[PDB]
């Protein structure tokens, strides 16, 4: 849906910012790499960075229980 998705994906199509994006956590024996990865049109890089950082900040606080519950179900399904 246009706005029927995770908040970042809903923003990905409200002004047609992203063409695709993904999140990753590449763990190593002693370290790792959290972060995100996305493709951009030439004139939309700034907006995607702004939205992405906003979501990370919004997760560092203002974390509703319902959103966490959805994440846990996704993790269970994906893991199995």
DSSP states of 7-54: HHHHHHTTTT-EEEEEEEEEE-SS-EEEEEEEEE-TT-HHHHHHHHHH
Q: Interacting stretch for other proteins, rule CB under 8 A, among 13-21, 23-31, 37-45, 50-58?
A: 37-45
Nearer to other proteins, 36 or 40 (CB): 40
CB of 72 to other proteins, least distance (A): 34
Q: Which is nearer to other proteins, 10 or 47 (CB)?
A: 47
Residues in a beta bridge with 20: 39
Residue numbers at the binding site for other proteins (CB under 8 A): 42-43, 45-46
């Amino acid at each position: 849906g246009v706005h029927l998705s995770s908040p970042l994906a809903s923003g990905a199509v409200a002004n047609k910012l992203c063409q695709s994006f993904q999140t990753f956590s590449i763990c190593y024996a002693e370290t790792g790499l959290l972060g995100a990865h996305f493709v951009c049109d030439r004139m939309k890089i700034d907006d995607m960075m702004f939205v992405l950082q906003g979501q990370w900040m919004r997760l560092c606080t203002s974390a509703t229980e319902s959103e966490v519950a959805r994440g846990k179900n996704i993790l269970r399904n994906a893991l199995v």
